RNA sequence: CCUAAAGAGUAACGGAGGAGUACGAAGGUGCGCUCAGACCGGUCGGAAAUCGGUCGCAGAGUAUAAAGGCAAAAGCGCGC
RNA sequence: GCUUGACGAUCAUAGAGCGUUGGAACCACCUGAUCCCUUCCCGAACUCAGAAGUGAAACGACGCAUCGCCGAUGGUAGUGUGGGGUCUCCCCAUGUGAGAGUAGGUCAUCGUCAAGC
């Protein structure tokens, strides 16, 4: 799917997901966007599932941008294994999402077609979304 | 048309500004520029949101009415809630007859359907940008800068230097030796 | 130019040592036509005594040689005494301690002030 | 030799030939450095003592031998052992070296229509090579080893290469 | 796991802050390298330890080119 | 100029077979004869 | 070095790496000097050898990991 | 007060870049390498003896905001204490309050000494 070509370190701490998205919250490339209104986490197979559904619906023209990149590795512990014995191995890559972040953008289509193409995408994502339009400020 | 009502603000801070947006439905603001000191004001959220539905809100002169004294300003910046999208703060720039000022002016693309690159080669018009930043005198600030794409073929790129501007208007970015793409014609996605 | 710029870089270590020790200094300047000597108090701020070839009894015409540097050296030592100073440190200001600079220093030693 | 020659007509003529308002900024040549980078002696180290002796004859100043500044395994060398030698010429030696190379040996090289004007950098210095070490009249033909590629480099006080070329219009430079 | 190693802590940092009264020989800073430089009345150890050579008060001033941080002793 | 390390330098005697003579200094200490010189070369005059 | 919560300290079969040496000069001192890289020009080398010039200023270097330092260079060379 | 040199205070609001200008003195370039001294070669640099030429190069002075560097007011983020919620995150009362950006500034300001007015 999507993941870094190479990274400095294999593993990472869990951390916390706090705050609003004051950066990456504007429509910068296209004319309409899908924007997160709740916080959460996107697992790079939901991003691919939602990209096919969006692109398969337009099927005639239109440019699409993906503004999210999953760069945080998460580990899992195999089943029937006790606590301890070192950290688990990396299983999938994921992205942190704060309220207000733009996920996908599109242009070159009508407002009515984009609005129903973004509805198909939002049905694959585990977080609340909204439809927004580009503004001067 | 372009008129806004404001009241002087005197209780400043984070706690006071949060009470404005819950209890009273107001919006904190500030007016600076000219040769005068800045001034904190308040204005209704419903009034500012209604004026901003207009297209040329940021490229037109606005008559501000603080108390009873009127003054000429221009929307310079605007803070929005990242999630809900409503306006939380606004700052205005005082307008003086002889003083160059910087504004953001939207672009208008016309005759897209009759473009050479579209009807002949089946290309698609892509808008790389949608507004440009200009500097000029207040008396000749344009509401929108015109760009046409009739004589554009497949693969041709439109730059800042190509488009013409009203007399007395400077493109700023072109002045700093950096012309940026505006639009192009490219081959179809599928 | 590079010629002067590299000399000031060459003279910084000795000057910074004297500020640390807070000792009186005897600074020398040498040009193609004259030579200079100054006694600077403890921190580069004030000049106590001075002597050069521009005094109105040495402006005779030949000031860019060795013996001209000898007369100023034995003249700056006299002026240092009037200021009640001895026990200074010689600062060559990046010039090599070989020629006109050396002849200047020997006159000061004979003049009475001791390094 | 060529000292007085430069200041009798070459310097006075170039003053008003480019229409100068002052006299020092007329181009003059400061130094000539020979250099000859011995690609061989990678491991043998048997031509340095031979390259030192021959290069002495052309000039008469004891040469200095240069060392590798890096490793670069592609040439199977590394820093520490020398790869080439060089000499620097100034004032009288480099003038008298010029005329001897100008025409005592340069006409009798082999085949040459002249010295091209394309061997100029962007500032006004000239560089040109020499394909055989025996070309000069200071050495023999039999007691000398095989071909060695001696070089010539010129350095002038020219702002740009055109008046550097103009200065080299004098000195009887075979420029085509 | 092949990671379980670490070294003992070295207890570095500032030992006397600005305004404090000092005596000759007092250690002022424990360092790696010179985050702070020796000013007036301050010496430097072979492991870059700043120590007092006079009696007075710590100063902690930034001055000169290079934007260096200096520690010096002044009159109380 | 460093001494004892620079070998003998002199004015020699140069004489081209065409009668051309230029007194230039070199390091041979003997007269030399030239078959060709600047006054008799095809490239210097357009041959 | 991170965890370690802007003084110190701080655990886990937590996340990452090194050591069990070297040097009689690789120590002391006086004197002197600045790198990597790029471009142009130049015999066999040609993107990369040595040479000339301009820019560059530390993107080099530091016996040995990483961190903190380095123009009075703590980097480089020579005499004693 | 005016100009030039030496040494400092202060380390970009003081820097870079562009243009103009300075030889009366000073400074710089300059001539030569006998003599002290020097180059792992070269009087290039260090040094010695002055002085015929020039302000070209360098340096200084004066202009310009183009780049750099400074930079508010207001708002926002975070946060100590007390209290709430729908409690992986927030809200209220009270105290505190950035970074970024915006309007806009900047072609420095001083001290001692010596030579000429
Ligand atoms: Mg955890
Ligand atoms: Mg606030
Ligand atoms: Mg609060
Ligand atoms: Mg030193
Ligand atoms: Mg530790
Ligand atoms: Mg010690
Ligand atoms: Mg701590
Ligand atoms: Mg802590
Ligand atoms: Mg600890
Ligand atoms: Mg414990
Ligand atoms: Mg060492
Ligand atoms: Mg390091
Ligand atoms: Mg040594
Ligand atoms: Mg603020
Ligand atoms: Mg609390
Ligand atoms: Mg604040
Ligand atoms: Mg700020
Ligand atoms: Mg800033
Ligand atoms: Zn002949």
Swiss-Prot record, chain B:
GO biological process: translation
Protein name per Swiss-Prot or TrEMBL: Large ribosomal subunit protein bL25
Pfam families on file: Ribosomal_L25p, Ribosomal_TL5_C
One of the record's GO cellular component terms: cytosolic large ribosomal subunit
Cited function: This is one of the proteins that binds to the 5S RNA in the ribosome where it forms part of the central protuberance.
Subunit structure: Part of the 50S ribosomal subunit; part of the 5S rRNA/L5/L18/L25 subcomplex. Contacts the 5S rRNA. Binds to the 5S rRNA independently of L5 and L18.
Family recorded in the similarity comment: Belongs to the bacterial ribosomal protein bL25 family. CTC subfamily.
Record-linked NCBIfam families: bL25_bact_ctc, PRK05618.1-2, PRK05618.1-5, PRK05943.1
Keyword DNA-binding (UniProt): no
Annotated keywords: Ribonucleoprotein, Ribosomal protein, RNA-binding, rRNA-binding
GO MF entries: 5S rRNA binding; structural constituent of ribosome
From Swiss-Prot, chain C:
Annotated keywords: Ribonucleoprotein, Ribosomal protein, RNA-binding, rRNA-binding
GO MF annotations in UniProt: 5S rRNA binding; structural constituent of ribosome
GO biological process: translation
CDD domains from the UniProt entry: Ribosomal_L18_L5e
InterPro entries, alphabetized: Ribosomal_uL18_bac-type, Ribosomal_uL18_bac/euk
GO cellular component annotations of the record: cytosolic large ribosomal subunit
Coiled-coil annotated residue ranges, if any: none
Keyword flag Transmembrane: no
Subunit-level organization: Part of the 50S ribosomal subunit; part of the 5S rRNA/L5/L18/L25 subcomplex. Contacts the 5S and 23S rRNAs.
Family designation: Belongs to the universal ribosomal protein uL18 family.
Purpose of the protein: This is one of the proteins that bind and probably mediate the attachment of the 5S RNA into the large ribosomal subunit, where it forms part of the central protuberance.
Protein name (database record): Large ribosomal subunit protein uL18
Organism of provenance: Pseudomonas aeruginosa (strain ATCC 15692 / DSM 22644 / CIP 104116 / JCM 14847 / LMG 12228 / 1C / PRS 101 / PAO1)
Gene of this entry: rplR
Curated annotation (Swiss-Prot), chain D:
Name of the molecule in the record: Large ribosomal subunit protein uL5
Role noted for this protein: This is one of the proteins that bind and probably mediate the attachment of the 5S RNA into the large ribosomal subunit, where it forms part of the central protuberance. In the 70S ribosome it contacts protein S13 of the 30S subunit (bridge B1b), connecting the 2 subunits; this bridge is implicated in subunit movement. Contacts the P site tRNA; the 5S rRNA and some of its associated proteins might help stabilize positioning of ribosome-bound tRNAs.
Assembly notes: Part of the 50S ribosomal subunit; part of the 5S rRNA/L5/L18/L25 subcomplex. Contacts the 5S rRNA and the P site tRNA. Forms a bridge to the 30S subunit in the 70S ribosome.
Assigned protein family: Belongs to the universal ribosomal protein uL5 family.
GO molecular function: RNA binding; rRNA binding; structural constituent of ribosome; tRNA binding
PANTHER family: 60S RIBOSOMAL PROTEIN L11-RELATED
Keywords recorded for this protein, A-Z: Ribonucleoprotein, Ribosomal protein, RNA-binding, rRNA-binding, tRNA-binding
GO biological process, one term: translation
Pfam family, one: Ribosomal_L5_C
GO cellular component: cytosolic large ribosomal subunit
Curated annotation (Swiss-Prot), chain E:
Gene3D superfamilies in the record: 2.40.50.100
Entry keywords, A to Z: Ribonucleoprotein, Ribosomal protein
Example GO molecular function: structural constituent of ribosome
Family affiliation: Belongs to the bacterial ribosomal protein bL27 family.
Superkingdom to which the source organism belongs: Bacteria
Pfam families recorded: Ribosomal_L27
Record bears the keyword Ribosomal protein: yes
Name of this chain's protein: Large ribosomal subunit protein bL27
Originating species: Pseudomonas aeruginosa (strain ATCC 15692 / DSM 22644 / CIP 104116 / JCM 14847 / LMG 12228 / 1C / PRS 101 / PAO1)
HAMAP family xref list: Ribosomal_bL27
Disulfide bonds: none
């Amino acid at each position: 799917m999507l993941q870094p070509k190479r990274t400095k370190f294999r593993k990472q701490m869990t951390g916390h997901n706090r705050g609003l998205a004051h950066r990456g919250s504007k429509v910068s490339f296209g004319e309409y966007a899908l924007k997160a209104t709740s916080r959460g986490r996107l697992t790079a197979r939901q991003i691919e599932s939602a990209r096919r559904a969006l692109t398969r619906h337009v099927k005639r023209g239109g440019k699409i941008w993906i503004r999210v990149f999953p760069d945080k590795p998460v580990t899992k512990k195999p089943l029937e294994v006790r606590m301890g014995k070192g950290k688990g191995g990396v299983e999938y890559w994921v992205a942190q999402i704060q309220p207000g972040k733009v996920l996908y953008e599109i242009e070159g289509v009508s407002e009515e077609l984009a609005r129903e193409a973004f509805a198909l995408a939002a049905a694959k994502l585990p977080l609340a979304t909204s439809f927004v339009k580009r503004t001067v400020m | 048309d372009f008129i806004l009502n404001a009241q002087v603000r005197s209780d400043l801070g984070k706690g006071a500004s949060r009470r404005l947006r819950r209890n009273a439905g107001l919006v904190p603001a500030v007016v600076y520029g000219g040769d005068k000191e800045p001034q904190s004001v308040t204005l209704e959220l419903r009034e500012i949101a209604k004026l901003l539905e207009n297209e040329a809100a940021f490229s037109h002169v606005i008559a501000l009415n603080v108390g009873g004294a009127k003054e000429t300003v221009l929307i310079k910046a605007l803070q929005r809630h990242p999630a809900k999208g409503f306006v939380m703060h606004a700052d205005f720039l005082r307008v003086v007859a002889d003083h160059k000022l910087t504004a953001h002016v939207p672009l208008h693309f016309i005759n897209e359907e009759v473009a050479v690159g579209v009807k002949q080669a089946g290309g698609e018009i892509s808008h790389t940008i949608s507004e440009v930043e200009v500097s000029c005198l207040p008396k000749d600030l344009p509401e929108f800068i015109e760009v046409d794409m009739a004589k554009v073929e497949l693969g041709q790129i439109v730059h800042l230097s190509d488009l013409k501007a009203p007399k007395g208007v400077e493109l700023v970015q072109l002045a700093h030796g950096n012309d940026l793409a505006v639009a192009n014609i490219h081959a179809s996605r599928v | 130019s590079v010629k002067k710029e590299t000399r000031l870089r060459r003279a910084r270590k000795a000057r910074l040592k004297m500020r640390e020790l807070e000792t009186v200094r005897l600074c020398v300047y040498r040009s193609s036509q004259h030579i200079y000597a100054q006694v600077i108090a403890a921190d580069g701020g004030k000049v106590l005594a001075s002597a050069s070839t521009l005094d109105k009894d040495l402006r005779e015409g030949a000031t860019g040689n060795i013996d001209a540097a000898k007369k100023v050296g034995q003249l700056v030592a006299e002026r240092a005494k009037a200021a009640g100073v001895t026990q200074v440190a010689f600062d060559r200001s990046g010039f090599k301690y070989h020629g006109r600079v050396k002849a200047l220093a020997d006159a000061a030693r004979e003049g009475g002030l001791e390094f | 030799r060529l000292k007085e020659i430069y200041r009798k007509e070459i310097a006075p003529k170039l003053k008003e030939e480019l229409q100068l308002a002052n006299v020092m900024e007329v181009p003059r040549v400061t130094k000539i450095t020979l250099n000859m980078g011995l690609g061989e002696a990678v491991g043998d180290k048997k031509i340095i003592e031979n390259a030192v002796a021959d290069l002495e004859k052309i000039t008469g100043q004891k040469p200095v031998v240069t060392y590798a500044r890096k490793s670069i395994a592609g040439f199977k060398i590394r820093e520490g052992w020398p790869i080439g030698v060089k000499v620097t010429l100034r004032s009288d030696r480099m003038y008298e070296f010029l005329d001897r190379l100008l025409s005592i040996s340069l006409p009798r090289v082999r085949d040459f229509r002249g010295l091209n004007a394309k061997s100029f950098d962007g500032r006004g210095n000239y560089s040109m090579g020499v394909k055989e070490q025996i070309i000069f009249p200071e050495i023999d033909y039999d007691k000398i080893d095989a071909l060695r590629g001696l070089d010539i480099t010129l350095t002038t006080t020219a702002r740009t290469d055109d008046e550097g070329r103009a200065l080299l219009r004098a000195f009887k430079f075979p420029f085509r | 796991t092949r990671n379980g190693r670490d070294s003992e802590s070295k207890r570095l940092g500032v030992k006397l802050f600005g305004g404090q009264a000092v005596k000759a020989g007092n250690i002022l800073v424990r360092q790696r390298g010179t985050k702070f430089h020796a000013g007036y009345g301050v010496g430097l150890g072979k492991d870059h330890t700043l120590f007092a050579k006079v009696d007075g008060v710590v100063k902690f001033e930034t001055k000169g080119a290079f934007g260096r941080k200096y520690v010096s002793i002044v009159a109380a | 100029m460093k001494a004892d390390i620079h070998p003998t330098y002199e004015a020699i005697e140069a004489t081209c077979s065409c009668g051309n003579v230029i007194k230039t200094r070199s390091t041979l200490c003997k007269p030399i004869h030239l078959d060709v010189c600047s006054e008799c070369h095809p490239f210097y005059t357009g041959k």
